Amino acid sequence: SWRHLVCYLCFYGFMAQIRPGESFITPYLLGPDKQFTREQVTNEITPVLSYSYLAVLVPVFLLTDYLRYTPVLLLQGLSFVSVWLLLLLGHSVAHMQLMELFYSVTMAARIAYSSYIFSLVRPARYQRVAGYSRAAVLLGVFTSSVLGQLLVTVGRVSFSTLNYISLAFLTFSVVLALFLKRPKSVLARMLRELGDSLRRPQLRLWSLWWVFNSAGYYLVVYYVHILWNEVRVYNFAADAASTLLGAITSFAAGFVKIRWARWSKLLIAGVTATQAGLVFLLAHTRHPSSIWLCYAAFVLFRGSYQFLVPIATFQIASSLSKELCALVFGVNTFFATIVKTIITFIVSDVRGLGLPVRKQFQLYSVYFLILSIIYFLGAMLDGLRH
Numbered sequence: 001s002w003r004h005l006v007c008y009l010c011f012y013g014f015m016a017q018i019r020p021g022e023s024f025i026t027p028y029l030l031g032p033d034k035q036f037t038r039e040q041v042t043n044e045i046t047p048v049l050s051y052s053y054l055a056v057l058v059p060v061f062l063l064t065d066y067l068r069y070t071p072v073l074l075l076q077g078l079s080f081v082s083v084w085l086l087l088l089l090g091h092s093v094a095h096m097q098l099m100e101l102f103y104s105v106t107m108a109a110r111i112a113y114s115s116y117i118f119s120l121v122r123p124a125r126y127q128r129v130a131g132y133s134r135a136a137v138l139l140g141v142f143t144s145s146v147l148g149q150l151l152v153t154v155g156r157v158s159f160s161t162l163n164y165i166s167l168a169f170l171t172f173s174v175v176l177a178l179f180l181k182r183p184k185s186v187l188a189r190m191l192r193e194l195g196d197s198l199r200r201p202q203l204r205l206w207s208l209w210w211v212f213n214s215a216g217y218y219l220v221v222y223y224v225h226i227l228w229n230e231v232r233v234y235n236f237a238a239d240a241a242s243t244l245l246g247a248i249t250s251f252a253a254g255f256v257k258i259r260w261a262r263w264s265k266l267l268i269a270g271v272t273a274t275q276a277g278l279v280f281l282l283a284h285t286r287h288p289s290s291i292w293l294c295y296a297a298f299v300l301f302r303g304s305y306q307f308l309v310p311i312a313t314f315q316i317a318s319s320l321s322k323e324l325c326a327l328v329f330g331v332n333t334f335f336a337t338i339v340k341t342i343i344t345f346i347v348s349d350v351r352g353l354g355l356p357v358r359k360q361f362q363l364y365s366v367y368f369l370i371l372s373i374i375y376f377l378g379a380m381l382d383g384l385r386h
């Protein structure tokens with residue numbers, strides 16, 4: 001129980017994140033294999049992903065707490081395998097929509113991995129496991145992305161070979177998940193315990209941070225691609241550097257020894273202010289011969305977010321019950337998604353306060369600044385009442 005538990009958990013987190021062809025799904029659909037039109041992919045496929053994610057997060061976090069997290073991790077792996085099988089053996093648009101449902105199912109089961117790494121270790125080791133596994137996962141993503149780009153830049157393999165490699169890696173990840181140790185009204189009980197746990201201050205603070213900062217981080221990450229496109233290899237370089245720095249910062253977060261009873265709100269306020277500054281750097285840096293500054297700003301922003309995430313998960317779990325952690329994570333993620341949607345309704349789409357990408361990033365920076373000011377006020381209130 002000494003080596004294999006944590007080492008194999010980190011190894012599975014790394015390998016389950018290896019999908020070289022996941023960054024080239026869109027071109028593969030538009031390439032000379034699927035022959036899908038651009039409208040078809042943009043309208044009938046990705047909105048399916050978003051809607052299915054929103055409708056699938058709820059059962060996932062309602063059930064992963066009960067069935068233990070190993071079945072849900074196996075389900076995530078099998079859904080990734082099904083996604084690539086549909087990619088390699090799907091001609092109609094309905095097959096691709098089913099693939100997007102399965103991809104949303106995969107995206108909804110990360111809370112299972114987090115709560116699983118948390119349920120296998122003594123609470124005194126909550127932080128380090130939070131720092132290690134997350135880092136590994138991010139490292140995996142890094143490797144995945146890099147691998148894909150390398151296999152399409154230095155190598156001459158087609159998208160079909162890349163998808164076959166991704167399917168083989170997904171099968172290996174499923175085999176790895178098969179050997180994971182399974183830990184050893186009901187809904188009314190769970191809701192009452194959730195409320196009682198939310199009465200605790202640390203859980204409130206870190207769940208609020210999750211809900212109102214993961215949404216902003218996902219908005220910035222998703223919209224920075226089109227922000228840079230509006231103004232190729234450099235895009236991948238920035239993405240890979242940000243992922244690697246995120247893994248490094250999660251690893252570092254595993255090792256920090258900050259007194260969280262008093263210096264938790266301050267830390268969140270400072271990091272959120274830094275993220276607001278970095279988003280403003282991403283937005284207002286319109287000088288064409290300055291893209292290194294924009295890339296550095298994005299890399300540092302992702303590094304800060306992936307530094308704060310393991311701390312958030314560890315402090316949420318340490319102030320929770322046994323069969324609650326996954327549920328809480330899911331709810332936060334669920335709420336985060338909703339928040340993001342709300343913002344992406346009021347800033348980009350459905351008329352609303354419609355603005356270009358630069359103005360959207362300015363509003364995201366102002367949103368992060370508002371959060372930072374709110375958290376600074378909270379820290380001042382905590383200090384004044386002490």
Ligand SMILES: Nc1nc(N)c2nc(CNc3ccc(C(=O)N[C@@H](CCCNC(=O)c4ccccc4C(=O)O)C(=O)O)cc3)cnc2n1
Nearest residue numbers: 022023025026041045046049100103110113114134137141
């Ligand atoms: N037509 C079409 N259709 C598609 N469906 C499609 N799809 C893709 C895939 N694109 C992504 C990439 C990343 C993410 C994502 O979620 N991004 C996170 C991951 C961090 C990893 N870490 C985790 O979140 C994680 C992963 C595994 C287990 C636990 C965790 C965790 O939360 O700790 C981040 O920060 O970048 C979502 C979609 C590309 N092209 C497409 N084209």
